[PDB]
Amino acid sequence: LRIIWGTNVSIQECTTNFRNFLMSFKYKFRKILDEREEFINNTTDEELYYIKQLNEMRELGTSNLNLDARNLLAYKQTEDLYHQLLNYPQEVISIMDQTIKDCMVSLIVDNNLDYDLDEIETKFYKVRPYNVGSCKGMRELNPNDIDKLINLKGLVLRSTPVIPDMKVAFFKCNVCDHTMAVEIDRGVIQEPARCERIDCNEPNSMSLIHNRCSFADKQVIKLQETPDFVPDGQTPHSISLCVYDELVDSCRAGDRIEVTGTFRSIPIRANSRQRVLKSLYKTYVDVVHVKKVQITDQDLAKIREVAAREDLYSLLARSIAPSIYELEDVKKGILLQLFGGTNKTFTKGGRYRGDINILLCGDPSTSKSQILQYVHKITPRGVYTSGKGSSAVGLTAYITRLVLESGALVLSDGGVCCIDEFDKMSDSTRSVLHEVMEQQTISIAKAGIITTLNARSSILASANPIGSRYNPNLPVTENIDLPPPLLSRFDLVYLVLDKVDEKNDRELAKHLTNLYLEDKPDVLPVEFLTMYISYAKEHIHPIITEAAKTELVRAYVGMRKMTATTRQLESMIRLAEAHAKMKLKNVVELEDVQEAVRLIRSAIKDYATDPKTGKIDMNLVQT
Amino acid sequence: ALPSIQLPVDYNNLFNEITDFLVTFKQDTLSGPKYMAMLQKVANRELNSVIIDLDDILQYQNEKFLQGTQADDLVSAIQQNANHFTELFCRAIDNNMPLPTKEIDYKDDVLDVILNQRRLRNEELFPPNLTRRYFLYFKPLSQNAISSKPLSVRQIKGDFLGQLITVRGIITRVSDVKPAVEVIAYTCDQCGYEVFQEVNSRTFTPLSECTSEECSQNQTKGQLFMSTRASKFSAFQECKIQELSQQVPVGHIPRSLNIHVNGTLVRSLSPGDIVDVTGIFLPAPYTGFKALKAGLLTETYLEAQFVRQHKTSDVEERVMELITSGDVYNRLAKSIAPEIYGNLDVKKALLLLLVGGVDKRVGDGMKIRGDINVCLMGDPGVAKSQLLKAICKISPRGVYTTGKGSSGVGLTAAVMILEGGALVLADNGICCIDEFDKMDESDRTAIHEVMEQQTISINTTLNARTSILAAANPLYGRYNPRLSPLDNINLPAALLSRFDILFLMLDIPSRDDDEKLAEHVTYVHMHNKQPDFTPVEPSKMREYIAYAKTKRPVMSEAVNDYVVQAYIRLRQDSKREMDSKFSFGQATPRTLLGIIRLSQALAKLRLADMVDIDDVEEALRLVRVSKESLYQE
DNA sequence: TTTTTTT
């Protein structure tokens, strides 16, 4: 038999265990390993999971086949093979790739569906085990763990450009015009000492030609250690993850990705020309699988029922921060911002941007930043920042030599942005934010490097009052202390002030004391509400209608009677489109525009605000 | 070229004595041989390293002297050439190694499986270092002298090379852990035989040519291939120890010294704490090209053997002794700054801050800090700076800082790749700010970013969990009754709310107070001890603080309702007490939180499993005393 | 590169 070196386990036996997993292993085995028999379905269980997966790979036309170490453990012989893989991940992965190819050929013949066995041979099946082990940081990874299968979660610090890889060397003889191809094993090309052609009779006549040499796609992605894995006292250590073929560019940089792989250690040459290599070995992880960290039909039905409920707007507001008290209007504005307005692009007038930015000002103990962290959790992509920690250059763009790097707002783009101590945030940073928010995109010019980075990020800001506690005598805008251009740029302005009464104090103290009374203590689940916002954006594309247009023109003229920025009217339209997404209405309606204007009026306590100078009586706040 | 010089030492007889000591030496005075037990643990692979005590060697030599047999002076020969003696010690450990009482899990050890296979195929085949999975170490000799006496970097000399020696100083930096190929294993396909190469240098040249007799018999020129699973690898870390400030002569800068820490000893150190490490001082060879220019001049380094940083049943017994002494809260308060006379309430608040309150994190995601922060506001000459320095010395990880001496950003995290600031050095400790009134509000904003939420934001982030203490002088240098208490504090209401408690002390002439303070101070001057209650030792005080922190008391329904009533009362008292002369700041729900943390700290000091209404009332009384000190005038 | 700070 053929045995992997040092394992005393046959490579044929590993392939046979993988074949028993691919066929003659029921999905019932994986479901039983998962237990939860009430959750498992008997018919899909009786069907063979890996047989269905190989047939699905044939239907896709792709050689790659996702692998589950849990399913490998579910099958008994495949569990033994998975332990052998944990010992020798690369060898067992090659064995499983060959087994997947052979099982695909056998499955094509068995199903009798049209397919080419030669096409299956040309295809190189891929085994991508996952759930082999608990996710761990790069700092947790060890040289003993090198050459052992593991599943790792990490946030991509950056993704490197695709790196050419010498899949096979090609030798072309300059003396005799001979053509040859030499496979590259272990990353080293093989060169015959004499000419491949005996008639040439020229020693070392063969010459490698790089263009003729076969190249396989390869890439690397820097991966930061997971925030839980990182030590509390120090920033996480980062190790780049090797990737190739379909795994290359599987996940974009700046988004969390879970890549199962085998850790690798390689000697580092003391000098590139010198054969000598330092006793220390550089360490990198080669990913057997790449994964992240879209609405299911049942989730979409649940979102539809929720959106049908009239209580759902306030329900999602409360669901953003279920434990928090008395900031439901700010949470509703944040939920509208998470839904976002629809974006319209035109040849003239540029492109109206649907993304909504929300500014919130609260006196200390407003729980505004607790709600902001709640919004960061609720957002599908979360960016949280402190005003003292915020920098304008970091928010817009950085340069490394000389190539531009994504700003903090650019990384926020594609998700909601959370800002704490927004009053403490620098006015210069806010001035940088003004242009980026007005354009919904960032443009940067600098010596050497000048480029524009997308900044289409919904922005949430939690701000202190300009006074240490919010002053009713102070104007609400002054208490928020936001610059007027940034306030116009923001779609929504939120004002929250504490109101004191004996019964209200009893209620607040009772809430805090109940959370304390538990030793560990209508709201949608936060993940379900993120999915609801995603489904609202996906299946709802609100646009200005006639009724919404009557409401919008009335609101614009009335706010001009009250001065109305044209951007505020666009922000009201975006909030109206956000409300239609919150209601899962395909187009903006008069009720949506009315709710958007009502949400803006309630957010800044404009109804509470006194008619003159914009100041709000404290009793008027919180009605 | 190599004139041999016979010396009064024979390595063979010394190694025989070492092997005899390994089997004969036992902890009978403390009570098979203890070294044999460690060898059995290593055979089971339960012990991954060995530490040979120099004091044990000296005791064995004393036993030999009592028996009349002449000692080979193994303990002193270690000081003579410890590097050379270490190889003999490893050989003696191999000779006296017992069989594994527990299975070594050889199947999981790919090296062990391949080693059995390689011996079978072969039937010093492989390096003994590759055979050994343990790292030797040397414990410093017990005081009763170069190894026993710690040294400064400048005090160390080139003659100390090749000698085990202890050093003392601040760790400037620690290099990142790197692999070290103790043995590089080369494999060639043409022979099918593995050829091992033992690397003992900082850099190595790969064999690059198959040395296998099978390849020699086949006449094939094989290309050796290194195998990570076959080659031995050891973690390598470096440390830079810099001379202590007292050890540095005036007008001289302390010198950091590179130290090699390998194997299990790697990653043992942290830069913040002073370390007393015994290690064989050894030359560091220069590279070829650099050595051609250096000439006879040579680099030097230290290979650490035993690492010790300055800062259970015994701890439990000490805490029980303090509890039996009783009144533990007031006793620890009076123990704080025994030389300082008075300010017992400030000392009690400082002890509460040292114990800290319970840190709470809600299931929804809310996190409320348990760390306590205190502020001291006093007139000049009231031992504000003295008490702050005493508290900094009391805190093993605490840092003392001045408002003018250090910038706020530098204290939070000093920009030179990020490096920990004074607050990061105060992690699991207390950052002290002397002359906090003099500190600028711009830096106070950086402090306010961290006081409310422990984490630091800059991008780079650190948890930066610590307790904050501040000492401030009143506006214009002294308290003015005409000025409101808030005006004399001259601090933002955000700072007042973030602080758990602020203490205001006034300098008022008094005949009896002057007489008592002069008596205590004159007693302190004539005799270093304070005249009078006996302060607890700082080690036992820190142990009691840790024991209190372990309690983590939780609130009850009655205590929570009483705290809610106190919050309502404080809010109403602020609403009615808008008069600035009597207004100490509006009631804060966060302040009641701070009050919750203080009650948790009091229940921790009392070691109560749950927070008590008495603890809540005591925290409220601390704040009330903070106001009443000014009210007395 | 990026503070730090002296001109």
Curated annotation (Swiss-Prot), chain A:
Residues engaged in binding ATP: 362-369
Main location: nucleus
Any one Gene Ontology BP term: pre-replicative complex assembly involved in nuclear cell cycle DNA replication
Domain of life: Eukaryota
Disulfide cross-links: none
Keywords assigned by UniProt, alphabetized: ATP-binding, Cell cycle, DNA replication, DNA-binding, Helicase, Hydrolase, Nucleotide-binding, Nucleus, Phosphoprotein
Keyword ATP-binding attributed: yes
Family: Belongs to the MCM family.
Protein name per the record: DNA replication licensing factor MCM4
UniProtKB/Swiss-Prot annotation, chain B:
Keywords from the UniProt entry: ATP-binding, Cell cycle, Cytoplasm, DNA replication, DNA-binding, Helicase, Hydrolase, Nucleotide-binding, Nucleus, Phosphoprotein
Binding locations of ATP 1: 341, 381, 383-385, 473
Gene responsible for this protein: MCM7
Catalytic activity: ATP + H2O = ADP + phosphate + H(+)
GO BP: DNA replication; DNA replication initiation; DNA strand elongation involved in DNA replication; double-strand break repair via break-induced replication; nuclear DNA replication; pre-replicative complex assembly involved in nuclear cell cycle DNA replication; premeiotic DNA replication; silent mating-type cassette heterochromatin formation
Documented EC number(s): 3.6.4.12
Cell compartment(s), UniProt: Cytoplasm; Nucleus
Name of the featured protein: DNA replication licensing factor MCM7
Positions annotated to bind ATP 2: 498, 590
Family, as annotated: Belongs to the MCM family.
Note in the entry: Present with 166 molecules/cell in log phase SD medium. Early fractionation of eukaryotic MCM proteins yielded a variety of dimeric, trimeric and tetrameric complexes with unclear biological significance. Specifically a MCM467 subcomplex is shown to have in vitro helicase activity which is inhibited by the MCM2 subunit. The MCM2-7 hexamer is the proposed physiological active complex.
Function: Acts as a component of the MCM2-7 complex (MCM complex) which is the putative replicative helicase essential for 'once per cell cycle' DNA replication initiation and elongation in eukaryotic cells. Core component of CDC45-MCM-GINS (CMG) helicase, the molecular machine that unwinds template DNA during replication, and around which the replisome is built.
Single annotated GO MF: single-stranded DNA helicase activity
GO terms for cellular component: chromosome, telomeric region; CMG complex; cytoplasm; DNA replication preinitiation complex; MCM complex; MCM core complex; nuclear pre-replicative complex; nuclear replication fork
Effect of residue 384 to A: Loss of MCM2-7 complex helicase activity
Motif (Arginine finger): 497-500
PROSITE patterns, per the entry: MCM_1, MCM_2
Domain annotation MCM: ranges: 328-522
First-tier enzyme category under EC: hydrolase
UniProt subunit comment: Component of the MCM2-7 complex. The complex forms a toroidal hexameric ring with the proposed subunit order MCM2-MCM6-MCM4-MCM7-MCM3-MCM5; loaded onto DNA, forms a head-head double hexamer. Interacts with CSM1 and MCM10.
